[PDB]
Homo-oligomer: A and B are copies of this chain.
Amino acid sequence: QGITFSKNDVEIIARETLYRGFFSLDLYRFRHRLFNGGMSGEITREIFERGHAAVLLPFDPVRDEVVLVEQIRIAAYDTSESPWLLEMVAGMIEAGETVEDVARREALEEAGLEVGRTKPILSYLASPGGTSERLSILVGEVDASTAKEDIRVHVVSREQAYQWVEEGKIDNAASVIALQWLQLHYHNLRNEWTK
């Protein structure tokens, strides 16, 4: 069951740089196997390359609270209520860094929070038709009574945060995914982290 093909079923002819700045835009030139047999001809796709990221949902299991960070994301401007988004702690992963190391470090730099235990939520591709970006989300144990780019730190109840997902007030993929996951898993998580 599940996916039909493997990495061996593609031929990446070229990854040609279209733009080289802080990030990159690459033209992938490739062929790939067809479900009915044989290979495609050459196909090209423009792919935004910005490396990958670690994401941390800071959850206080004693108080049933989430810590959110607020900062401007200018790309949200054209389609959003405001470009200041309420987000998860997150950071890009640089060479040799692990997801958990980045998540724990960014919790301290962005929320002023020390993380205790962590558990994986999931790792997802943000928009794989046009970008390679993968983001790996952890939930991290925090004490939301602990006090601390231009960031403002918010502490809200889990119920409020999830209601803001339902209402569309929180609508960035990382936060939606993490908070939907929390809504599905928080009972067991509180059990585990308050035992």
Contact = CB atoms under 8 A, between A and B. Distances in A.
A188 interface: no
Contacts of A85: 3, 125, 128
A46 B74 contact: no
A144 to B, nearest CB: 16
B25 A169 contact: no
A100 to B, nearest CB: 17
A181 interface: yes
Main secondary structure on A side of the interface with B? mixed
Contacts of A166: 122
A42 to B, nearest CB: 12
Interface string A116-138: 00000011111111111111000
Number of copies: 2
Nearest to A126: B127
Contact of A131 (B6, B21, B48): B48
A132 to B, nearest CB: 4
Contacts of A48: 25, 48, 130-131
Contacts of A12: 74, 77
Interface of A: 2-7, 9-10, 12, 18-19, 21-23, 25, 27-28, 30, 32, 34-35, 40, 43, 45-48, 50, 52, 70, 72-86, 122-135, 150-152, 154, 164-166, 168-169, 171-173, 176-177, 180-181, 183-184
Given A79-B125, A125-B172, 12 more contacts: A3-B86, A7-B83, A32-B83, A45-B74, A48-B48, A73-B125, A75-B129, A75-B130, A77-B132, A80-B125, A125-B171, A127-B173
